Structures are given as structure tokens and as C-alpha cells.
């Protein structure tokens, strides 16, 4: 029988229909419309709230907390220009305090516009949200964040009016506003996220403000977005040496994000395996999102030294996805807290690399194998990548023939059968009888039949020799 | 499990007419619940060979 | 089986060195410093009577 290929994989169904990929694209466009509809309804509500309190309260002065509540809601929805006359009169009336300034600068980073950018524009990539928030007035919001920081430190000197030459730089309010400044500057452009570890951090050191754990995590996230990993791991190495009790999850989230931008996928594996090992701080769904997206960027990355001679090699990195999802079940990370863009690619890796025991008993049936061949024969133009087009270290002088008796042990049956007539002058050296040298099962019976054929041929040849010359 | 995944996938590139089987000896924590399986005194009427 | 045992062992040497090394880089970060799990702290203070 013709042999079957043992290095050919079993035919199994790993893929989706053209209707299903269209229906995934159609359903994902509906919820992108739903988040676009949800933002503009609430944006129009805060703009109607602004014009109501400006028109009907034209001469009646509002209480300062209502104007403070509307100023943070304007800044959260990306409307920074409608909020700066509100904060300028609240600072002039001296109604703002230490916590109020940190509330306004944290609102200036717009955590309502970033929610629309995440679900609709950035395709649920948490690294791309910082890259896309910098375009909607990134330099303009950074100047007002620097201006409100100068408004804050001027107010803190009034609010602190012993430790008198070391106020307000030694208080908790100075670092809280400085942590609010670095959080707002991360949402700005590339010129301002580069100024966080260099310009803002040295200004905090020159002012003598003691940092906190949220200070270092935003600096590590700022160095993560630049792509500088030799400095980002050094800050956590300072935190691993000195302040190890206060390390939260966001330092690990910066390093998982940072090696994803630098495309060092071997490093981001070791950070995830470290977080599974220590199990403290707890793995957020942002940890599972940043690590699984680094797998998919590594899986869709083409290689160029074999130049894809047979297939894509990096697609084997999606086999780790059932291992990571099994680790999320024990870490307490719910897999339903994953984004819709990532969950389609996670289930893409699951139907390609996962099988159950009930399916493994039925996946090799000849009916399913021959359906795979006919479906490749009928429509292979729709789903194909090709159709689109002693001890040796102390040995040096070896001791040979150490009188080890091979006659105490018994291996007596090593008889070998060679072909008849090797040195015979009548038998030729080359011939088709040379193929008898490669035969193992019938080695004894073939060469004794071959010797009996060659002995009778040389006997009949030499008896024909003696008959012809004796007759003439 | 990354090494167990790599060890199980050696069956796909073995030699001609050569198979393999895998043995795995791992440590696993087992709980002896002394409430589900309590240590009780022997009964007043003990069991015999007829049980 | 002898030539396969040279083929699989060289495969499991280079793979097994890589997985231990990425584990070795995780132990040396855990030995430099870290915060103790409160679920781990509650596991030691769990018995009624100690030694």
C-alpha cells in the first residue's frame, strides 16, 4: 500500500464564513455608531447647560460650586475654551482651593472624549488613545495645563500663609497637582509627553516637591510612549529597591504598553509571566488587554530572513492564547472584560488553536477529511493565501582495549550473508545483482537462491565450454 | 504550560515510523477535609464479616 | 531512536534554556523587592493554634 504522510496535519475547520466576517464588521459598526451617539447627546446636554446658566443667570451671580461643577464637565467633554473664563474668575474670586485645582487639571485631560476615541477611532487600543488625543488641541490644552499649574502654586502659597521656606513645596497638595499635570500632559502631543520625564520631572526636583507612586507611573508611561525601555525599567528598578510596598498595577501596564510600542515581544512575555508569578498587585483587564494585543501584533508581524518560503512562521504565537486565557481564570481576570476588537481576534486564535476531548475523538473521521478536500476543490479561490495572487573532560589519551571480556556475554548469532562470486573472474563486478546488497527481511533466502542460480549458471556455462571444443 | 505545549507538539515532526508517548509527574495540592471526612469514634454495634 | 534522541534533546535544550531564563529574570526581580499578597498574608494567619 502507498504510505500516508505523517507530517501532514489533520484537516480541521479553523475559519469563518464570508457572511460571518461581514456580520462581525456590520455589528462592530453599529456599536461604533452607538458610542458616537452617546457622546454627542451628552456633549449637547452640557452645552445646553452652559448656555442656560449664561443666559438666564446673566446678572445673577452663581455660587462657586455650580460654576466649578460645570467647568470640569466642559473640560471632560473636550471643551476647554468654554471652561477657561470660568476658572479665571474662580481664581480671581479666590474660591478655588488645593483639591479644586487638581480636579480641574485632571478634567483637562478629557476623560469623556477619550472614551469616544477608544471605542470608535482608536479601535480599542489603549496605546492609540494617547496618540489620538494629542491631535484635538494637544498643544493648546498643554499651555492651559501649565497656566492652571501656575494658578495652583500661586494659590497654594496664599493658602499656606513652621516649615515656612519649605511651603507649599513640601505639602501633599503640591505633588497632587503635579501628578494631575503629568496626567493631562500625557493626553497631549508628542512634544509634551517627551517633556514629562525631562522637563516636568526636573522642574519638580528643582521645586523640591516629593513625588508619589502616581508620579513615577506617569513618567514610566511617558517613557513608554517614546519607546525608551532602558529608562522605563530603571524607574521600576528604583521602585523595586526602595519603595516596594506601594507599587501598583499601572507601572506594569506602562511596561506592557512600552515594549509593545518598541516591538520587543520577548520582554513583554517576561513581564506577564512575572505578574502571574507574584499575583500582587492584581491583574486588571488592562493587563490582559495590553498583553494579548502584544501577541496579536507579534502574530501578524511578517518575517524576512526566510522570506515566507512555505508559510507565515509568527502565526504559531497565537497558540499561547489558550494558555493565557487559562491563566486569567485563576488570576480572577474575567474574559468578558475584553474589548470587542480584541475578542474577535482572541476567538480567531481559539478556533485555530483549541480542541476539546469530545471533538478530538471525532475530528479525524474520513467524512470530515474528505469534506475538507472537496471544499478546497469547489471554492478554494475564496479562502487561500496562494489563490489571491570514559569522562571526556579528563580523557585525553584514551585507554584502548582494557581486556573487557566479550565472551562472558553472549552475542553469538552475528552471521552475515554476502553475495556469491565477489572475486570470480567470470562474474562481473557491476550488475543488477548489486541491488541484492540492500535487502534485510529475506537476506538469508535470497542470496542462497542467488548462489544456487550463479553456481548452476557457471556449471552450465563451463560444461558448454568443454562440449564445443571437444567436438571440433 | 509553555513547556508542556512545546513538549506535546514534538509528535508532529517525528522521524519515519517512529512514535512517542508522554509521562508527566507533577506536584498538586490535595485537601483532606476533616468536615466532609471526619474522624469519628467506632459505632456501638461494629461491622462483621457478613457486611 | 538514537538519532531521534539527539534531535529531540537538542530541541528541548534550546527551548528549555529559554523558558528557565525568562523564569530566571522573573525570580531576580522578585528577589530585588516586591509587595506581599494580602491573600498570602492571610494564609499564614489562618490556623487557630500555632506551634
Amino acid at each position: 500500500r502507498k504510505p500516508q504522510n505523517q507530517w501532514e496535519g489533520v484537516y480541521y475547520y479553523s475559519g469563518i464564513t464570508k457572511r460571518q466576517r461581514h456580520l462581525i464588521l456590520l455589528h462592530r459598526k453599529r456599536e461604533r455608531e452607538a458610542h458616537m451617539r452617546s457622546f454627542n447627546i451628552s456633549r449637547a446636554s452640557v452645552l445646553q447647560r452652559l448656555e442656560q446658566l449664561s443666559g438666564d443667570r446673566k446678572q445673577e451671580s452663581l455660587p462657586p460650586h455650580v460654576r466649578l461643577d460645570l467647568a470640569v464637565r466642559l473640560a471632560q467633554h473636550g471643551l476647554y475654551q468654554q471652561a477657561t473664563p470660568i476658572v479665571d474668575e474662580l481664581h480671581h474670586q479666590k474660591a478655588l482651593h488645593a483639591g479644586h485645582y487638581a480636579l480641574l487639571i485632571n478634567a483637562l485631560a478629557c476623560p469623556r472624549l477619550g472614551q469616544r476615541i477608544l471605542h470608535c477611532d482608536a479601535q480599542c487600543d489603549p496605546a492609540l488613545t494617547y496618540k489620538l488625543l494629542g491631535d484635538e488641541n494637544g498643544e493648546e490644552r498643554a499651555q492651559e495645563a501649565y497656566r492652571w499649574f501656575d494658578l495652583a502654586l500661586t494659590s497654594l502659597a496664599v493658602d499656606c500663609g513652621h516649615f515656612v521656606p519649605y511651603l507649599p513645596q513640601g505639602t501633599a497638595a503640591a505633588s497632587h497637582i503635579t501628578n494631575a499635570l503629568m496626567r493631562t500632559l500625557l493626553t497631549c502631543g508628542y512634544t509634551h509627553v517627551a517633556a514629562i520625564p525631562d522637563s516636568v520631572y526636573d522642574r519638580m526636583g528643582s521645586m523640591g516637591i516629593s513625588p508619589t507612586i502616581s508620579t513615577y507611573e506617569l513618567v514610566m508611561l511617558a517613557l513608554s510612549l517614546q519607546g525608551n525601555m532602558v529608562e522605563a525599567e530603571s524607574i521600576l528598578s528604583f521602585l523595586r529597591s526602595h519603595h516596594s510596598e506601594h507599587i501598583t498595577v499601572e507601572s506594569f501596564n506602562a511596561l506592557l504598553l512600552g515594549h509593545r510600542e518598541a516591538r520587543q515581544f520577548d520582554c513583554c512575555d517576561a513581564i506577564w509571566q512575572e505578574l502571574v508569578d507574584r499575583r500582587w498587585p492584581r491583574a486588571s483587564p488592562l493587563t490582559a488587554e495590553l498583553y494579548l494585543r502584544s501577541i496579536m501584533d507579534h502574530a501578524n508581524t511578517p518575517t524576512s530572513e526566510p522570506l515566507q518560503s512555505f508559510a507565515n512562521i509568527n502565526v504559531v504565537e497565537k497558540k499561547k492564547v489558550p494558555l493565557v486565557l487559562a491563566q486569567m481564570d485563576e488570576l480572577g481576570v474575567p474574559r468578558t472584560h475584553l474589548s470587542r476588537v480584541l475578542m474577535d481576534e482572541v476567538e480567531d486564535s481559539l478556533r485555530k488553536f483549541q480542541t476539546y476531548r469530545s471533538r478530538f475523538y471525532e475530528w479525524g473521521r474520513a467524512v470530515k477529511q474528505f469534506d475538507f478536500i472537496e471544499f478546497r476543490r469547489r471554492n478554494g479561490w475564496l479562502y487561500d493565501l496562494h489563490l489571491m495572487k570514559g569522562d571526556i573532560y579528563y580523557d585525553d589519551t584514551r585507554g584502548l582495549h582494557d581486556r573487557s571480556p566479550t565472551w562472558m556475554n553472549e552475542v553469538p548469532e552475528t552471521r552475515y550473508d554476502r553475495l556469491y562470486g565477489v572475486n570470480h573472474p567470470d562474474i562481473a563486478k557491476i550488475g543488477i545483482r548489486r541491488h541484492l546488497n540492500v535487502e534485510y527481511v529475506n537476506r538469508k533466502e535470497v542470496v542462497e537462491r542467488d548462489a544456487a542460480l550463479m553456481k548452476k549458471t557457471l556449471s552450465s556455462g563451463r560444461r558448454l565450454r568443454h562440449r564445443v571444443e571437444s567436438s571440433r | 504550560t509553555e513547556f508542556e505545549k512545546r513538549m506535546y507538539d514534538i509528535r508532529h515532526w517525528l522521524h519515519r515510523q517512529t512514535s512517542c508517548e508522554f509521562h508527566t509527574i507533577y506536584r498538586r495540592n490535595v485537601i483532606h477535609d476533616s468536615a466532609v471526612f471526619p474522624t469519628e469514634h467506632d459505632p456501638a454495634t461494629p461491622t462483621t464479616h457478613e457486611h | 531512536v538514537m538519532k531521534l534522541a539527539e534531535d529531540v534533546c537538542m530541541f528541548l535544550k534550546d527551548v528549555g534554556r529559554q523558558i528557565v531564563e525568562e523564569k530566571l529574570v522573573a525570580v531576580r526581580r522578585l528577589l530585588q523587592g516586591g509587595a506581599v499578597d494580602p491573600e498570602l498574608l492571610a494564609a499564614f494567619n489562618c490556623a487557630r493554634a500555632g506551634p
Binding site: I16, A311, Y383 | - | -
Partner: peptide, 30 residues
């Protein structure tokens, strides 16, 4: 015709059939 036993028994070439052809699940049962 066959492969001899003293030859090295290496894999001749790998086969990627399941990654070139992504087949959807098709069963005759509902």
C-alpha cells in the same frame, strides 16, 4: 519507492495545509 533504514529519517518538507486553507465549520447536522 521507500526509505531505507540506514538513511537519516528526517522530515522531508513541512506541510501547512490548515493555515493556507482556513475552512469554516460545515456539518450536515444542524
Amino acid at each position: 519507492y521507500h526509505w531505507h533504514y540506514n538513511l537519516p529519517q528526517g522530515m522531508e518538507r513541512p506541510h501547512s495545509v490548515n493555515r493556507t486553507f482556513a475552512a469554516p465549520f460545515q456539518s450536515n447536522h444542524s
